[PDB]
């Protein structure tokens, strides 16, 4: 009863945190690491992200500078970010990487503001589903008489409460992202 309400409230803080992270690779003016973690390479065999392979030092809020653990895999990185939808133009002095990063245009503006929406809204049903869980566990407490109908009820209105909460703080980092992308 309780295990099934303080075990659902670390699974929503748990989605909500993984839902601030896929929002923040989210492509914006004002570039960031966190665009370049969901690029990866061939790293023999198995596949690898740019972000455990290449330290990502950010100089202007329009300019990432890239300088890659080893000097020879420089190349097929540059090649990862040609081919993202970033919709960046790669360059290296040899050893670095220079990656200016355009101006949005307003059609792609809107195109990733949907995309916010739609990690938000996957975000949101799942924080439902990990409620419904454990609501449906508490309705199975209170058939079995495993607890008092008082008890069950309370932990009900609370966990109810306790979901409201996360699906709000999702709209929250939705709208911001939303609103960072209009200016």
């Given at each position: 009863?309780?295990?099934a309400?303080?075990?659902?409230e670390?699974?929503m803080?748990?989605?909500?945190?993984?839902?601030?992270?896929?929002?923040?690779?989210?492509?914006?003016?004002?570039?960031?690491?966190?665009?370049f973690?969901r690029?990866?390479?061939?790293?023999?065999?198995?596949?690898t992200?740019?972000?455990?392979?290449?330290?990502?030092?950010?100089p202007?809020?329009?300019?990432?500078?890239?300088?890659?653990?080893?000097?020879?895999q420089?190349?097929?990185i540059?090649?990862?970010?040609?081919?993202?939808?970033?919709?960046?133009?790669?360059?290296?002095?040899?050893?670095?990487?220079?990656?200016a990063?355009?101006?949005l245009?307003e059609?792609?503006?809107?195109e990733?503001?949907?995309?916010?929406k739609?990690?938000?809204?996957?975000?949101?049903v799942?924080?439902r589903?990990?409620?419904?869980?454990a609501?449906?566990?508490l309705?199975?407490?209170?058939?079995?008489?495993?607890a008092?109908?008082?008890e069950?009820?309370?932990a009900?209105?609370?966990l109810?409460?306790?979901?409201?909460?996360?699906?709000?703080?999702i709209?929250?980092?939705?709208?911001?992202?939303?609103g960072?992308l209009?200016?």
């Open positions: 009863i309780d295990e309400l303080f075990d659902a670390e699974k803080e748990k989605a909500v945190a993984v839902a601030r992270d896929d929002l923040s690779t989210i492509r914006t003016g004002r570039a960031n690491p966190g665009m973690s690029i990866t390479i061939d790293y023999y065999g198995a596949a992200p740019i972000t455990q392979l290449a330290s990502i030092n950010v202007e809020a329009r300019l990432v500078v890239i300088k890659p653990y080893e000097a020879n420089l190349r097929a540059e090649t990862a970010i040609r081919n993202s939808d970033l919709g960046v133009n790669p360059t290296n002095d040899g050893a670095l990487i220079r990656v990063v355009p101006q245009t059609e792609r503006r809107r990733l503001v949907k995309q916010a739609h990690k938000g809204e996957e975000a949101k799942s924080v589903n990990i409620r419904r869980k609501m449906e566990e309705h199975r407490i209170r058939k079995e008489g495993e008092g109908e008082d069950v009820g309370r009900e209105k609370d109810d409460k306790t979901t409201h909460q996360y699906v709000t703080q709209d929250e980092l939705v709208k911001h992202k939303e960072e209009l200016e």
